[PDB]
Design an enzyme around this catalytic site. Structure first.
Site, PDB file in Angstrom:
ATOM      1  N   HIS A   1     -27.545 -22.678 -11.083  1.00  0.00           N
ATOM      2  CA  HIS A   1     -27.311 -23.100  -9.633  1.00  0.00           C
ATOM      3  C   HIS A   1     -27.153 -24.682  -9.501  1.00  0.00           C
ATOM      4  CE1 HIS A   1     -31.400 -23.571  -8.615  1.00  0.00           C
ATOM      5  NE2 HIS A   1     -30.916 -24.542  -7.848  1.00  0.00           N
TER       6      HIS A   1
ATOM      7  N   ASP B   1     -29.989 -16.996 -13.471  1.00  0.00           N
ATOM      8  CA  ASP B   1     -29.863 -18.320 -13.130  1.00  0.00           C
ATOM      9  C   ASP B   1     -30.372 -19.369 -14.152  1.00  0.00           C
ATOM     10  OD1 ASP B   1     -29.263 -20.778 -11.377  1.00  0.00           O
ATOM     11  OD2 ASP B   1     -30.947 -20.092 -10.181  1.00  0.00           O
TER      12      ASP B   1
ATOM     13  N   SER C   1     -35.343 -27.723  -8.010  1.00  0.00           N
ATOM     14  CA  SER C   1     -34.756 -26.529  -8.689  1.00  0.00           C
ATOM     15  C   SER C   1     -34.379 -27.036 -10.001  1.00  0.00           C
ATOM     16  CB  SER C   1     -33.781 -25.698  -7.844  1.00  0.00           C
ATOM     17  OG  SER C   1     -32.801 -26.443  -7.344  1.00  0.00           O
TER      18      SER C   1
HETATM   19  C1  LIG Z   1     -30.391 -15.275  -4.025  1.00  0.00           C
HETATM   20  O1  LIG Z   1     -29.433 -15.884  -3.225  1.00  0.00           O
HETATM   21  C2  LIG Z   1     -29.566 -17.074  -2.919  1.00  0.00           C
HETATM   22  C3  LIG Z   1     -30.651 -17.501  -2.336  1.00  0.00           C
HETATM   23  C4  LIG Z   1     -30.927 -18.674  -1.809  1.00  0.00           C
HETATM   24  C5  LIG Z   1     -29.763 -19.815  -2.136  1.00  0.00           C
HETATM   25  C6  LIG Z   1     -29.914 -21.240  -1.507  1.00  0.00           C
HETATM   26  N1  LIG Z   1     -30.526 -22.040  -2.580  1.00  0.00           N
HETATM   27  C7  LIG Z   1     -31.773 -22.127  -3.032  1.00  0.00           C
HETATM   28  O2  LIG Z   1     -32.707 -21.355  -2.717  1.00  0.00           O
HETATM   29  C8  LIG Z   1     -31.774 -23.136  -4.359  1.00  0.00           C
HETATM   30  C9  LIG Z   1     -30.423 -23.711  -4.191  1.00  0.00           C
HETATM   31  C10 LIG Z   1     -29.346 -23.159  -3.191  1.00  0.00           C
HETATM   32  C11 LIG Z   1     -28.528 -22.212  -3.922  1.00  0.00           C
HETATM   33  C12 LIG Z   1     -27.274 -23.213  -4.592  1.00  0.00           C
HETATM   34  C13 LIG Z   1     -28.935 -21.471  -5.091  1.00  0.00           C
HETATM   35  C14 LIG Z   1     -30.899 -25.114  -3.393  1.00  0.00           C
HETATM   36  C15 LIG Z   1     -30.303 -26.263  -4.248  1.00  0.00           C
HETATM   37  C16 LIG Z   1     -31.340 -27.425  -4.186  1.00  0.00           C
HETATM   38  C17 LIG Z   1     -32.783 -26.708  -3.513  1.00  0.00           C
HETATM   39  N2  LIG Z   1     -32.308 -25.319  -3.292  1.00  0.00           N
HETATM   40  C18 LIG Z   1     -32.834 -24.332  -4.171  1.00  0.00           C
HETATM   41  C19 LIG Z   1     -34.057 -23.975  -3.802  1.00  0.00           C
HETATM   42  C20 LIG Z   1     -35.152 -23.301  -4.803  1.00  0.00           C
HETATM   43  C21 LIG Z   1     -36.319 -22.849  -4.462  1.00  0.00           C
HETATM   44  C22 LIG Z   1     -36.872 -22.961  -3.286  1.00  0.00           C
HETATM   45  C23 LIG Z   1     -38.321 -22.458  -2.985  1.00  0.00           C
HETATM   46  N3  LIG Z   1     -39.070 -21.992  -3.908  1.00  0.00           N
HETATM   47  N4  LIG Z   1     -38.768 -22.641  -1.673  1.00  0.00           N
HETATM   48  C24 LIG Z   1     -36.057 -23.577  -2.383  1.00  0.00           C
HETATM   49  C25 LIG Z   1     -34.734 -24.024  -2.700  1.00  0.00           C
HETATM   50  C26 LIG Z   1     -28.693 -19.194  -2.516  1.00  0.00           C
HETATM   51  C27 LIG Z   1     -28.499 -18.037  -2.794  1.00  0.00           C
END
Ligand SMILES: COc1ccc(CN2C(=O)[C@H]3[C@@H]([C@H]2C(C)C)[C@@H]2CCCN2[C@H]3c2ccc(C(=N)N)cc2)cc1
Ligand SMILES: [Ca+2]
Ligand code: NA
EC number: 3.4.21.5
Lengths: 28, 250, 5
Positions: B43, B99, B198
């Site tokens: 991602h 991922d 991330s």
């Molecule tokens: C399972 O399906 C999904 C779940 C969540 C998301 C939203 N997303 C995330 O959680 C990560 C990603 C985005 C995306 C681009 C992956 C973005 C890009 C920058 C940071 N963020 C990621 C992210 C990763 C981990 C955490 C956490 N541990 N709190 C919080 C956020 C999108 C899809």
């Protein structure tokens, strides 16, 4: 062959400030 | 990293910053697994719902860093990307299954006090360490709060959570290629990865051979450090056959 | 970010 052994810690037999917390959680 | 602390010098010498060239910004974390290969979340490079589609020329890899913003002269190394490899079954359409991505560097990086590769687990490592209650470690230059930015690399230790608890915390479909980590409301302690972290590593120190292993990649969450929510991580061992296939072929 | 050389 040298993966996962840190030059400033494992290589010189020094421990970081919180690695013991990890070891203490590995209870099996 | 929310509710973590300042890293020690050389504490995470496998830590990689993925850095956008134009504009200049932190894109993601990543990790050094050999002199020529970097591991991250898919991602971080490809997410069509947000029109994210990076090419090799869009970014740089910065290795051996401690300060977030400073150019760490005589310490950090800056590397260009030769080729990006995204898992072919990365499921960005549904639930972010698989991922994971690899980056091959244009030239091998010299190892130093500040730059050194992490191990990848084998089946036995995974069986020994991936247990509820066992703690691993997450590092990065990401947000200090869900809603600023750290001066230096941040570190937090977090316990692996029982799969039923992970499942019951979210409406998202969890797969065997994911695990979750973090403290429960009743546990009193806190901490999580956040925006900017991330793609970065979740590591554990084997008590059998005293080596660090990357068991996870920071994958996804709902907010950051929220009560009753947990961070989710790509399960590195479950995807190791793919990792090996890519490195063997290319 | 500080500029890179
Ligand atoms: C399972 O399906 C999904 C779940 C969540 C998301 C939203 N997303 C995330 O959680 C990560 C990603 C985005 C995306 C681009 C992956 C973005 C890009 C920058 C940071 N963020 C990621 C992210 C990763 C981990 C955490 C956490 N541990 N709190 C919080 C956020 C999108 C899809
Ligand atoms: Ca559920
Ligand atoms: Na939480």
């Amino acid at each position: 062959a040298d993966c996962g052994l840190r030059p400033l810690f494992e290589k010189k037999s020094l421990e970081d400030k919180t690695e013991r917390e990890l070891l203490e959680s590995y209870i099996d | 990293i929310v509710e973590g602390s300042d890293a020690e010098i050389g504490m995470s010498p496998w830590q990689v910053m993925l850095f956008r060239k134009s504009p200049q910004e932190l894109l993601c974390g990543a990790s050094l697994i050999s002199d020529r290969w970097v591991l991250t979340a898919a991602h971080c490079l490809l997410y069509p719902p947000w029109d994210k589609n990076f090419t090799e020329n869009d970014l740089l890899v910065r290795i051996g860093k401690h300060s977030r913003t400073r150019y760490e002269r005589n310490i950090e190394k800056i590397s260009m990307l030769e080729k990006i490899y995204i898992h072919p079954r990365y499921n960005w359409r549904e639930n972010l299954d698989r991922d994971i991505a690899l980056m091959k560097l244009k030239k091998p990086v010299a190892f130093s006090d500040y730059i050194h590769p992490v191990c990848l687990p084998d089946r036995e490592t995974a069986a020994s360490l991936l247990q509820a209650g066992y703690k691993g470690r997450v590092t990065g230059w990401g947000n200090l709060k869900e809603t600023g930015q750290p001066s230096v690399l941040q570190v937090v230790n977090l316990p692996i959570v029982e799969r039923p608890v992970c499942k019951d915390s979210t409406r998202i479909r969890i797969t065997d290629n994911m695990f979750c980590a973090g403290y429960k409301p009743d546990e009193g302690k806190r901490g999580d990865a956040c925006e900017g972290d991330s793609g970065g590593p979740f590591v554990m120190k084997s008590p059998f051979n005293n080596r660090w292993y990357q068991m996870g990649i920071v994958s996804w969450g709902e907010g950051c450090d929220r009560d009753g929510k947990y961070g989710f991580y790509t399960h590195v061992f479950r995807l190791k056959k793919w990792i090996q296939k890519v490195i063997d072929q290319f | 970010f500080e500029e890179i050389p």
